[PDB]
């Protein structure tokens, strides 16, 4: 029942309820003539919503807000971007204009600025060292170390046992490495093991792109990254 590129028309977003008060959002974008799906997270925060990641661009992100407004009807007050690339921060301006408080680590904000990307407004302290965790309302934010990017965060929802791995975790269908331009291939397995050690109770694991699974996605990702490293 998870949405695929198949049932997502250009510029639209689908929502998927994972657990009580936790959804993913799914959008699509084209590059080099192929079409890629992309996930973020929505976490209910009392009578407000916490958003994890944009929907990969201004158009998609305005569609995301409109779909949330339609289907959940609680205000998005805060968003966290889990790394600096455009599939995670593209649309920050749209969120900012809609009165959403946008957040990221100083690591991410720095890299976004270097990249000439949109820059989340607010800074998340206490995540600069590998293994650092901070609470952010109904989630914990964890910096497991460099992996897909040097700044990548993961997000755990303790009430629902949902681990959102973002782009540091691969879906099972991906059996070769994706975009690694800014990756730390050397540290990526170590970083995944920190995630394993910190959230061994996770029941649902959501990759940045494609299908949810369980903690098997961590070892899966390790296998893929190691195979790439040894090319
Ligand atoms: C969506 C995959 N991706 C991730 S993960 N980080 N960066 C990307 C990315 N690759 N390309 C071609 C674009 C436009 C983006 Cl964003
Ligand atoms: Zn990326
Ligand atoms: Zn603010
Ligand atoms: Zn991504």
Residue numbers in the entry: 32 to 262
From the article:
BLs are categorised in two distinct families, according to their catalytic mechanism, and further divided into structural classes (Ambler’s classification): class A, C, and D serine β-lactamases (SBLs), which utilize a catalytic serine for β-lactam hydrolysis, and class B metallo-β-lactamases (MBLs), which, in turn, require divalent zinc ions for catalysis. Finally, subclass B1 MBLs inactivate nearly all β-lactam antibiotics, with the sole exception of monobactams. This class includes variants such as IMP-1, VIM-2 and NDM-1, whose worldwide emergence has characterized recent decades. Here, we present the identification of a series of non-covalent scaffolds targeting SBLs and concomitantly MBLs, through a large virtual screening study, in vitro validation, microbiological analysis and X-ray crystallography.
High-resolution structures of compounds 24 and 31 in complex with VIM-2 and NDM-1 MBL have been determined by single-crystal X-ray diffraction at 1.60 and 1.38 Å resolution, respectively. Two molecules per asymmetric units are present in both experimental models. In VIM-2 binding site compound 24 orients the central sulfhydryl-triazole-based scaffold deep in the pocket, with one of the triazole nitrogen contacting Zn1, while Zn2 is coordinated by the sulfhydryl group. The second triazole nitrogen interacts with a crystallographic water molecule. Surprisingly, no other direct contact is formed between the inhibitor and the surrounding residues. As mentioned, with respect to the apo form, Zn1 and Zn2 positions are only marginally shifted, maintaining a distance of about 4.6 Å between them. The side chain position of key residues involved in the metal atoms coordination, i.e. His116/94, His118/96, Asp120/98, His196/159, Cys221/178 and His263/220, is conserved. For compound 24 in VIM-2, the docking prediction orients the molecule in the opposite way, where both zinc ions are coordinated by the sulfhydryl group and stabilized by additional hydrogen bonds with Arg228/185. Still, a slight adjustment in the pose orientation can be observed, in particular because of the presence of Phe61/62, not detected in the X-ray binary complex. The lack of the residue side-chain is likely associated to a higher flexibility and opening of the loop L3 observed in the here reported structure, with respect to the structure used for docking simulations.
